[PDB]
Amino acid sequence: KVQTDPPSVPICDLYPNGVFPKGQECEYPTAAWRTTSEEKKALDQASEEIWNDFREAAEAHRQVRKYVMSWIKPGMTMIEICEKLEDCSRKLIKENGLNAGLAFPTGCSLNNCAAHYTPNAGDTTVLQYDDICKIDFGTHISGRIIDCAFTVTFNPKYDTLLKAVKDATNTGIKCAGIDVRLCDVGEAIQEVMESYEVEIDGKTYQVKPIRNLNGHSIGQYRIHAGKTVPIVKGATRMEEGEVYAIETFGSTGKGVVHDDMECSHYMKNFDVGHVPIRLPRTKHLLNVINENFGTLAFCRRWLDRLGESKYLMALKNLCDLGIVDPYPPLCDIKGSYTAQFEHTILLRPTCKEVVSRGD
Ligand SMILES: Cc1ccccc1OC[C@H]1CCCN1c1ncnc2nc[nH]c12
Ligand SMILES: [Mn+2]
Ligand SMILES: [Mn+2]
């Protein structure tokens, strides 16, 4: 009934009465009347089993990330890192089809690559001492997703770039709240990130937010629910009961990402309904996706793990039909360095809970 070393005990077995620990609770940016309002307390208690699912997913995410930090080292292949992390995540979340599991593939994007890189089979990439690696993974219970990421480095030359991005993410978390404008969250993040200047191998940079990357609302089994949180200047509001991934990306490059490298990430389009398919390999792959992932993102390694082979044409057919969308790695210019920090927040009627942050 205590967690093992390495962790193998499901979070569900660690909390025998089914009540999971809350994340950090904050007052909204006076908004104090919310924590004692009898109607807000009733409205909060109404969604309690929902918050409880996010909390179970968040405790699994915190235990996996402390475990990753203990062993991630240069010399490991990216496949080895992803498999070791996912093996742990599956055990702690007590994976059970679409009821509990991994919410999206483990990102381990390196250097100028900011996001959506996970190795496909046969990728020989090895983590290097000078690499800047963004570990971004997700867990869910009943489709209540925790989207939380951090940057791993071994060389102290990146310390101030990581501090800039962490400070910008924390500013975003602080600025966020019920009825707060999303563009106001974006402007606060940019101001903080751009106050930092960094020196890396004798070159100086003013840290740039990646202008075409952003935070986002989260929906049930829907990593992007439709609202985006900008990380640069340039007036939609946050609403009560919403869930957001507050994330920032800092870059020493142009502060703009473009699609590059082989695609690993894919996700069924939430707006496309039932589409009958007769093509047998394409029909089979769609059934595999519907059974195992639904509208959650998946990667090619996860198809290989399910025993699927020779599915690339079937997968391209699904993309061409608009049923599945590809999400290729997003990179800034060659030679640039990118960092990321991300947390999931619940906009509860009574308080703001940074559910992925322990407290
Ligand atoms: C729908 C959509 C519209 C526009 C842009 C991106 C996007 O979807 C991108 C999703 C699918 C792949 C992985 N995706 C993730 N989205 C958010 N945060 C993530 N953290 C790790 N993977 C994450
Ligand atoms: Mn993420
Ligand atoms: Mn995200």
From Swiss-Prot:
EC number: 3.4.11.18
Catalytic activity: Release of N-terminal amino acids, preferentially methionine, from peptides and arylamides
Positions with a binding annotation for a divalent metal cation 1: D136, D147, E342
Chain residues that bind a divalent metal cation 2: D147, H216, E247, E342
Keywords, in A-Z order: Acetylation, Aminopeptidase, Cytoplasm, Glycoprotein, Hydrolase, Metal-binding, Phosphoprotein, Protease
Localization of this protein: Cytoplasm
GO-annotated molecular function: aminopeptidase activity; initiator methionyl aminopeptidase activity; metal ion binding; metalloaminopeptidase activity; metalloexopeptidase activity; RNA binding
Domain of life: Eukaryota
GO biological process: protein processing; regulation of translational initiation
Post-translational modifications reported in the UniProt record: Contains approximately 12 O-linked N-acetylglucosamine (GlcNAc) residues. O-glycosylation is required for EIF2S1 binding.
Cofactor binding annotation: Binds 2 divalent metal cations per subunit. Has a high-affinity and a low affinity metal-binding site. The true nature of the physiological cofactor is under debate. The enzyme is active with cobalt, zinc, manganese or divalent iron ions. Most likely, methionine aminopeptidases function as mononuclear Fe(2+)-metalloproteases under physiological conditions, and the catalytically relevant metal-binding site has been assigned to the histidine-containing high-affinity site. Also manganese has been proposed to be the physiological cofactor for human METAP2.
Claim: Membrane is one of the keywords in the record: no
Cofactor: Co(2+); Zn(2+); Mn(2+); Fe(2+)
Binding site for substrate: H116, H224
Keyword Disulfide bond on entry: no
Main location: cytoplasm
A Gene Ontology cellular-component term: plasma membrane
Description of how the protein assembles with itself and partners: Interacts strongly with the eIF-2 gamma-subunit EIF2S3. Binds EIF2S1 at low magnesium concentrations.
Annotated function: Cotranslationally removes the N-terminal methionine from nascent proteins. The N-terminal methionine is often cleaved when the second residue in the primary sequence is small and uncharged (Met-Ala-, Cys, Gly, Pro, Ser, Thr, or Val). The catalytic activity of human METAP2 toward Met-Val peptides is consistently two orders of magnitude higher than that of METAP1, suggesting that it is responsible for processing proteins containing N-terminal Met-Val and Met-Thr sequences in vivo. Protects eukaryotic initiation factor EIF2S1 from translation-inhibiting phosphorylation by inhibitory kinases such as EIF2AK2/PKR and EIF2AK1/HCR. Plays a critical role in the regulation of protein synthesis.
Family membership: Belongs to the peptidase M24A family. Methionine aminopeptidase eukaryotic type 2 subfamily.
Protein name per UniProt: Methionine aminopeptidase 2
Top-level taxonomy: Eukaryota, Metazoa, Chordata, Craniata, Vertebrata
Name of the gene encoding the protein in the UniProt record: METAP2
